[PDB]
Amino acid sequence: SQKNGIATLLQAEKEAHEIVSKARKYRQDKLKQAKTDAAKEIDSYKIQKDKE
Amino acid sequence: LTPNQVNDELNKMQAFIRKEAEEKAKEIQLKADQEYEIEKTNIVRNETNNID
Amino acid sequence: TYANYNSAKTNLAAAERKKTGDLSVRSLHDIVKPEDFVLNSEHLTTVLVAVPKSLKSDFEKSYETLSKNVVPASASVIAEDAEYVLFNVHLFKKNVQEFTTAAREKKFIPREFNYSEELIDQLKKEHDSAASLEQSLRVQLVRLAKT
DSSP: OHHHHHHHHHHHHHHHHHHHHHHHHHHHHHHHHHHHHHHHHHHHHHHHHHHO | OOTHHHHHHHHHHHHHHHHHHHHHHHHHHHHHHHHHHHHHHHHHHHHHHHHO | OHHHHHHHHHHHHHHHHTTSSOSSSOOOSSSOOGGGSOOSSSSOOOEEEEEEGGGHHHHHTSSTTTSSSOOTTOOSOSOOOSSEEEEEEOOOSSOHHHHHHHHHHTTOEEEOOOOOHHHHHHHHHHHHHHHHHHHHHHHHHHHHHHO
């Protein structure tokens, strides 16, 4: 009836929205990793040059 | 025939849409991975050159 | 002024024309149930297929014997004009055109429409404007012609 054509369908919409939200979270955390890893590597290079 | 055809069809393609969601999420996360790699490598190279 | 009056009269004629005819554009705004018209997501698109009264049996077994996932218990008429009927048929989000082509091979007249309040407001306001403007222009022209 209305229930299996509306409520379950909206829940499937919620599943899809959850999947895309998780994709966004992957993107965001990956970009923050791209920044933080570079930040840590530049210091490693800087100290290596400075010590010598 | 019995209307079980109806449930068969709806469940089949509601699973097809979910696999579509899964594959698009896979593509998105992978592409984010390569973008992460590229940005990190570019920044580290750029700063290391100046340090040297 | 008389040209404007005749323009208003033909506007009234146009407005009254749509009150009679089949269902390809026939209005379903106050006798339409949005609950029988699922819109939240692209999973079951309730197409509005209309047929004359002749093909009752030929249509009633066109969804529940050949179609795919037409939501059961809802494929019937919302309002009948003694000559044509309607049906709240559903189908996929990726194979609408194929089923539409099959129906038009069966020679049905689909009704594609968006449930919007502004449309009903436009209907009411154009009705009122045409009628009132025509009447007031008539009487103002009475004074003007007398003068």
